[PDB]
Every structure is written in structure tokens, then in C-alpha cells.
Amino acid sequence: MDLLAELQWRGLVNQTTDEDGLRKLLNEERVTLYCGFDPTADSLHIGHLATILTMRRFQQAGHRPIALVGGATGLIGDPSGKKSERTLNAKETVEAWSARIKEQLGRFLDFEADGNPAKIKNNYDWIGPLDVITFLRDVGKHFSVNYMMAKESVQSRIETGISFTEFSYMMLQAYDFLRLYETEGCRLQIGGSDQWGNITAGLELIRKTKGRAFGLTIPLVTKADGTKFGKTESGTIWLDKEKTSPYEFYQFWINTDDRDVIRYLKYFTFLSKEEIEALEQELREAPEKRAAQKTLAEEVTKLVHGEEALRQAIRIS
Amino acid sequence: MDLLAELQWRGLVNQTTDEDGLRKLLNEERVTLYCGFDPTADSLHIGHLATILTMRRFQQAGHRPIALVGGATGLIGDPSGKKSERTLNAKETVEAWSARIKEQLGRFLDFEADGNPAKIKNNYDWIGPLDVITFLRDVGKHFSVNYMMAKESVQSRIETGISFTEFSYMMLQAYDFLRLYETEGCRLQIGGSDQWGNITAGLELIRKTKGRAFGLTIPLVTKADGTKFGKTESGTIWLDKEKTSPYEFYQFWINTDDRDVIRYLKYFTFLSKEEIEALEQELREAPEKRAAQKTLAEEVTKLVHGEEALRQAIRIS
């Protein structure tokens, strides 16, 4: 209602399976929602900040967030948003990366809150032990190959090529939604832009097994110059202070182009509409001062690394 | 060489992955071959007799046959030769049917022979315990969706529709070939006409995991009138004497149309070329005597039910 209207003002709504039904439920109950993160490295990066902070915004509005660590799916790999087949990482690798990712996730969510404290979960727990036969019958009977082939993630790749491995990824995410729906009362799944197909697949599966739940995607973060958000000359801006120091983290935001700063404040910060607007007028009137750029840099660095870390970044600058 | 030439004379060769390479190996070694049979009922029927007796012919020529009971795959189902999606049978059903099928299979093969005694095996043993993740990675990475979609069994059905369940069947048969290749030295897989794709899938998988093995399909049994072999007004001619009595079994063969009798003698019996030819001339010269028809009926009834059973059939007629 107002949460949903606010996200919209901010631009964090790409798509929604049924906006009025979701607004309605958000307005009448504490909604359990989840978001999945697959260990594809030993650290999350700024590419994950939008869904993460979005989770946070949902928690502040009274809902209960589940951060799902992709222990099982990180072992298959999501073709979604990938032009090319990826290499399979080893269980040992994935297993190790999961532990860390778990650690950075927990930074952004509230565990003390009574009524809506977060949960961090690993799909390895229910996928690890599932036998193929069970999977093929209990999940697979519900999907036709034709439904699956039309998916953006797959349509996107059949000429390009895609193994059966990645083609099936979608069934596993489908299955996560169902299990979470069942054991946690999960009613909403959120994800980036590219997760649309995978989310609606979970919806398909719930619908066909139960006959009530929603999906919401966050848009790909844009740059006015048409380049790839977070694509630096330095390489990736990580959330691990040992990969990307607080000083570098800080610099990255402080170098936001005047053209992007206002969209980034809305996306990445907890500043009000009136604070964001005020900054917009200050950017108009005094753009060499770089007020919007320091506020973003401070806000986001504090979020991710905390105040002391920010203090250093500042004094190092 | 001569075995292969004989099958050819008989018409039991539909296709072969590489005839000269297979002739060669058959001629230089005791070849371990296998054939799969999925419990789709509590009894085999005459639709299975051609691959079965063909197995037998391979054993008589000195090779070692493995009859594979489809315990695991009978739980998924093969779309091959099926215009429509099938219903999933329960584990309890399949499990019970497997035990019987095992029993009728053993009738046709030699277990006493030293050097080439048969084996009866159940793919449940290696598929039952396989985890989805392992399956997706170890088997699935080897296949592109595009390779799989072009398969006759699938091409055959995407408009018609096919679940992910049946679409994946082929990976499981693929996997059987590999395991058997590995643990039993299996070098040849045989099957009916419709198994071509599933067999070449096992070949794909061996090739891609090892970098040596063959496939041979038996043709669909024809009727000169263009109707469906074994399609009776009575319904299916079963190999279970309690479903189709020896008398009815016997009658069915004795009613072979003059047009089919000679192809059926070649397919279904252990009569020599010279015996079969002689019958061909007797059919020419005295077709009201029905000599080719009684010889077929006696031969096949004895094979399946034994002499006493035949004796009854005869005296009951």
C-alpha cells in the first residue's frame, strides 16, 4: 500500500505478479517473503545490494524476511542473465563460499525483532537429500518442456546452447518457493530483474500442488551513460572489506555521476522522499559541491561497513 | 559376422550404430550386451518377445546377456513410442510388477553356462540412491537441451506436450548404459525400434565420459494387412499363462495369416534357414494344410510355456 507505493516511487519495482492482491495482503498481514543468493564467489558484491536493502525495507515495514543461501543451486547454476554456460564449482568451494555469504547477509537484517525477525536458510538442507526419482516425479510432472523453453533464461540460450543441468535449475528454485511456502508460510518471493521466470516457475509449482502467493522483481540498476552498473576499471566492488576496502567502497559511490546520483539515493539509501528531493534541488543549484554524492557515499558505506569504517574512509580521502 | 548376418536374414536388424565395428567385435570377443524392460504391467506380452529371443540368439552364439529390469525408470516412464503422456504408477505397484517380470525374463536365458551365463539386474539399485544434484551434474552437464529435443521420442511430442519427467527419462537410460559399461564391461545395448534415441543417448554419455560401444534396434513387427501386431479382439497376448492361457497363446499363433507366417518364423523361432525355406515352399504348394502356422504355434508355445503346456493346448484344440 504505502510500502509498495514507496518502492514504486523509488523505482525498485520491475514487475509484480498481481499488484493489487499483493498490496492488499501486505496491508492486512505480516508477510513472510524470501530472496535467494547463490554462492558464485566468496563474497557478495554491489550487484546484490538492491535486493538486499529491499529485503530490509520490507522488514522495517513489519514483514518477515528469509535470506536464502543457495547451497544446493550454487552447485547447478542459474543461466538467468548469463549469455554463457558456466563452469561447475566444487561442493567444497560452494560449501566454503556459503559460510561467508551467510555472514555478509546477516549484516543487513534484524534478528532481535520479535514478530518479524529474519531467518537465513540454505536450500542444501532440503535439496541435498532429495533423490532424483522423487524430484522427477514430485516436481517434474508439474512442468511441460514447452512452458520451460519459453522462459527468458532459456529462450535466451538454445542456439547459444544450454546443458540439461542449467535448463533444470528453474525446477530447483521452483521447489524452494514451495518448501518455504509450506514450512514458513512464505507468500512472496523477490529477486532481481532476471529472476522473473524462476519466480513464476515457483508460482506454477505452488498453484499446481495446492491450488495465494506473489512475486516481485527489482529492475536492473541503470547508468545514464549506458554502461554496466558496478563495472569498474578496478573490477568488482565487493562487500568484503578485504577485497574492496572501505576507502575504495566509499570512493566508488563518491564518484557517482550527477546523472545517476538521484536514482542511486532512492535505490540504495534509507533517506526520506523529502530528503532525497531536497538533495535533488541542491544538485540543481550547486553541483560542484557534490552533496548528493557524499550523502550517498556515507549512507551506503555505513550500511555495509559501519561508521568507524566510514570514518577511516573519510579521513583516508 | 555370421550371427549378425543371420539376424539380418531374419529381419531383426532395424538399425545399428556401426555395423562393421560391431561385426568385428562380435567376431573377436564374448560381448556383454543388455536390454531394458520396464514394468508397465504385471506381465510382459508378445510385444517384448522379439528383443527377448534376440537376446537368446546372442547367448547361443557365445555372448553374455544382461536383462535389465526397469525398477527405477518404470517410475518415470518412457515417452518413446507413446503419443501420450502416461500416468505415474506407484513405487509399490512397480516394485511388485518388477518381481514377476524378473520371473518371466529368466525363462528365456541360460544361467548354467560358464563363460556366458546371463544376469538379470534392476536399475533401482543404482538409480534409487542417486541424489538429484549428482544426477544433474554428473549426467546432465553432458547433454544440451538441443540434442535432447531433436530426439524422435521428444520431437514426436512437444505440441502434443511432454512433462519434464518424461523428457528426462532418456538421461536415466543413458546412465544405465554407462554404469553397465563400467561394472559389467557392457559394449552393446539392444532394444526395439523406438529405443534408437535412448541408446544413442547412452553412447553420447559414454563417449563424453570416457572418450567403443554399439547400439542395435530390432524393427517393429509388421502385419501384411497394416494392422498392429499383437492387437487382438481379445486384448493383449500375455506371457503369463494366468492372463493368457497356453491354449489362447497357441491359437493366436495358429491364426497367423499366410502373409505373415514366414516373417514370424524368422523372428520368433529357432528353426534354421533351410527349415524356414522348406516351410515357405510348403506354404506355396499346400496352404490349406497350415504347416507353417502349426510349427510357429508349437515352437513359440514351447519356448514360452514349455512342452506340457503345448501338449494341453494341442489336445484342448
Short description:
The structure is a homodimer of 317-residue chains. Chain A is 51% helix and 9% strand. By secondary structure, chain A is α/β, with parallel strands linked by helices.
Write the layout of secondary structure elements.
Two copies of one chain form a homodimer.
Chain A: H1 2-10, E1 15-16, H2 19-28, E2 32-37, H3 49-60, E3 64-69, H4 91-105, E4 119-122, H5 124-127, H6 132-139, H7 145-149, H8 152-155, H9 164-184, E5 186-192, H10 196-210, E6 214-218, H11 246-254, H12 258-268, H13 273-285, H14 291-305, H15 307-316
Parallel strand pairs in A: 2-3, 2-5, 3-4, 5-6
Antiparallel strand pairs in A: 1-6
PDB class: ligase (synthetase)
Keywords: ligase (synthetase)
Assembly: dimeric
